[PDB]
Amino acid sequence: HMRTSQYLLPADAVVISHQLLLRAGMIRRLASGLYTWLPMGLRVLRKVETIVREEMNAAGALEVLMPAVQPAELWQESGRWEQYGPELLRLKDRHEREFCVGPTHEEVITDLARNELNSYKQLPINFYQIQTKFRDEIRPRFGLMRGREFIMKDAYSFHLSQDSLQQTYDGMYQAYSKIFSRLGLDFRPVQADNGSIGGSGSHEFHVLANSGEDDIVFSDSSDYAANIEKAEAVPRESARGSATEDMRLVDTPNTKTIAALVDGFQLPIEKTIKTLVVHGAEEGTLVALIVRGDHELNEIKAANQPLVASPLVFASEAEIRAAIGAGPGSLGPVNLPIACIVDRSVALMSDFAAGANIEDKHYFGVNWERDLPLPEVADLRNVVEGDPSPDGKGTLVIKRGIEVGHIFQLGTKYSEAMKLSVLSEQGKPVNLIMGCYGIGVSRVVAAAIEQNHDERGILWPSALAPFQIALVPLKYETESVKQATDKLYAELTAAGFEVLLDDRDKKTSPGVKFADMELIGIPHRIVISDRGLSEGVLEYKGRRDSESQNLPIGELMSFITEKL
Amino acid sequence: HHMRTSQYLLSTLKETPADAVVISHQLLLRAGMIRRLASGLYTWLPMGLRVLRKVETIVREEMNAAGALEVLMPAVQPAELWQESGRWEQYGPELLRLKDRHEREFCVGPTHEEVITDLARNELNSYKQLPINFYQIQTKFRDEIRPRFGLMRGREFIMKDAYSFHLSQDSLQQTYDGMYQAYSKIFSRLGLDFRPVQADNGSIGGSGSHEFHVLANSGEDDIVFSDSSDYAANIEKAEAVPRESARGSATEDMRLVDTPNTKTIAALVDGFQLPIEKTIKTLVVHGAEEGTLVALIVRGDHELNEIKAANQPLVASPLVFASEAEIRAAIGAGPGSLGPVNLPIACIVDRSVALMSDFAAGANIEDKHYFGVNWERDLPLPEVADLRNVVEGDPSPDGKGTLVIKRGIEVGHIFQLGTKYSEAMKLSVLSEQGKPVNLIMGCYGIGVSRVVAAAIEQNHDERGILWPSALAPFQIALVPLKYETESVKQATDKLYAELTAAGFEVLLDDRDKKTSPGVKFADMELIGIPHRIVISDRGLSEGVLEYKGRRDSESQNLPIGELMSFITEKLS
């Protein structure tokens, strides 16, 4: 008998999921980013794991279990030993051999693949695991959301052709949809950054919650959906305005922000531009990226520009001063001695202000072609709320998302570097084309609470509830109650329901018991008492019900079976 | 959606390393169940993972039935907890230590005593909560100095580790007996021939422990049984009593003899035609009093038991043998010339040595021995104790029968820990009376990875693996002949669907004719699948399938109409 004598058990906790996971006796902190699953919490995790496993299996993926401790030599082959960065936990064994604790498993599976895959007849094939990762998050926080040790489902698929990858990638995308549907989450798949302008080689899956760290973008009139990183921006204006002012050089002291320029000289913000200087791909060069004053530079879009070094490095003040002859706050496209790219919206601007590339000065009345030639145009900005959908169908809305899934097309990145090759039917060597697919299993648990909670505590989706029914007997010590209760437990448990019986003594009031069952998020409660048994009635309340109701002892099993 | 050999069996060319010297390691490799990543680190391949999960499930069912609560604790653990217990320093070089990016110190958990104790001192705040038993099935790491024998001595491996908490020793005993009973059901259900034995607590510590062993010829432990009672013990723990009932009369006078180039029992025996049962070995070890030495004496055919030796109050624990320089300074003679006569250090003799007569021993003079030594006449008998290992045929210490020594693979070990952690880490709860009680603890471990391998060590034949029923990765193998032909394909796929629907685990061999039927049949047997069904045109035209059991010598025809009834019968 699962009893409450066994199972039940701030300041550091800021987000709701962290607070309620602690209070509901689901997890306990061991150290920074390291949490034990308590008995109640583990039940939830297992239900997530099961559903994930079920759908992965149904999509044709084969479950493996790879080691956490991995030899550095494999990581040196991929170059990620160095390149992965300080989240990689590195160590040495007693023989001074070097290893990491796995943040992910691309290298391990690739090593497996090149030893186990030696025929085209084995392909396509998709391996996955549900296994504990380590990532040395610099500032572990938000409970399970940014842990160091966490549970991930990671899958890896191997292919002979790009078309074969697409099929599996689609099937994985479809499997993710089912998973998150069955977990009863309000979620969305979105386009994500694949490291190029255009393409659909990456997708994310987000639990919609107001605490989400990602901004995700949807058309209100189409299927368009993307992370703001990936979301294409097109201008609200259809044409460039005609020149109505002459360009003039103006003294602008203490004017190093858009706000200073707007308020100082009573300009509309739509008539100002920012110039950000970044390193170019060509050694020792700089590029100027220009967005409108009320817009932000998208750093993903910036880096993805051929001309711009990837990853993105902003120029130092000294670099900018040596190159241009003035500093941030006084920069612009007029008499600019470095390469320049302007945003689509900037290209349609007119009679606009800009730094003069002379300290504490701006040009007003700048017009393209008349005053200077228009530089290369590109999509450089973040979309904003209400912008046109880039597919040409509707306007954009911006919601917050908690990423719980992320899929990728890898190409031959790993297969080239680690020499994973298979002979085709024709006998031509083929570097295997690869995809990989990840779900933050432990993040999912937290994300469910972020989305689903109330003032009484956790509201589980039905598939995640640790127990289905809570039996609350009043003065279980009385033997008449303690026979009805135990009969009830037996029947319900026999009918294949998960039941928790509150076995606690009189020192725990019925009120506290009711609060705990709701805090933990049990969807159904039944109350037994002498008063109730006398009249042959049981008291039943739903988790999201306003008031309790009385049910005849005989008709409960039929009633409860309906609810569940 | 079928489970197919083209996916599951992976490469034809298997790892065949030089160190693959045990059968479990070889067959696990050859049947595509594990693959090596590095020393002591193995991936569970799809076939192999299926077997692991079946062990875990049964383990989990019985832990839950014994009322233990499943948790899941981190692998990476802060050093500060290990410093509280003292094990940060004391555990030794099998503890894998590391630093994070902030220079903070951690280990990867070899076991979780400190973590579960730290949990208890935060979660256990009332006597009404006790007794309570927590367990997990979770990946450990131990930096085994020479990883070998595949899964048996890995570095990363799966353990089910449980920990119980108690206000009294009587409470602990009840739970400990429950876990003992629960372990028996697990290994019974896993279809293993196993035995629980009395054990030493070892480095885990405490007083009172048992091991569970799978009986196998490749077992690293020596396990001792009576031939007439239920007496069972690891040779580490097994009490030794003499075969001799009393001390024989002195027949020889003691005399000094020159014995140059005589520094082994064998050399003494061969040199002087002495029975080995009339010789003694003197081992000099460090005493508990710092700077002191103790001589331990066993009969020349016997071995010193190092656990028994360390447990002697006079002898330092852990056991340290004295150097030749220490011995020569102390005694004036070296190894090969040592004995109890005119010995200027403390001495302890084995029980069997106490009953010896007319024996030979080193004279504590270089290159000399005494022959015809007799206790009391020539020198007083020093302290007596149980110092040796038992041998085949010795009296059972319980009094019933004579001992027999078998070889065992340890797959479980349970311990009574007392308060060694709860005292060190300040874990206390008030009793009903309101008095502070340091919680009394026990811990229980099953080597889940080792179980998989141990099953193969015990159960195999010339054709490959023999899985016990509950462990087989699949129950049925469908081997269609000309799966490409639509008739056989339709029948095969139909057959897969029906069997799957009944709840059987089926593997379909979808490989083309480049893999011959003979290789297919061998592959299926090597993996250890208990039942196969062959589908062919010649069969379907007669309305029969060709069945064969893994343990059968011949096939038999099976009418299609009686499929479920026949196969159901076989799988029961």
Ligand SMILES: Nc1ncnc2cc(-c3cccc(S(=O)(=O)NC(=O)[C@@H]4CCCN4)c3)ccc12
């Ligand atoms: N600190 C953390 N705490 C809790 N959950 C976490 C989940 C991920 C996570 C989850 C899914 C996918 C990814 S990923 O990095 O975008 N992708 C991968 O790792 C790929 C896909 C699977 C194999 N490699 C990260 C990263 C950090 C986490």
Ligand SMILES: Nc1ncnc2cc(-c3cccc(S(=O)(=O)NC(=O)[C@@H]4CCCN4)c3)ccc12
């Ligand atoms: N190198 C290895 N490879 C594979 N499996 C292994 C299992 C154990 C193992 C298994 C069970 C119990 C123990 S133990 O050390 O005797 N006891 C404990 O660790 C106790 C039991 C619960 C936790 N502490 C070790 C030790 C090394 C192993």
Ligand SMILES: [Mg+2]
């Ligand atoms: Mg670039």
Ligand SMILES: [Mg+2]
């Ligand atoms: Mg300036």
Ligand SMILES: [Mg+2]
């Ligand atoms: Mg001692």
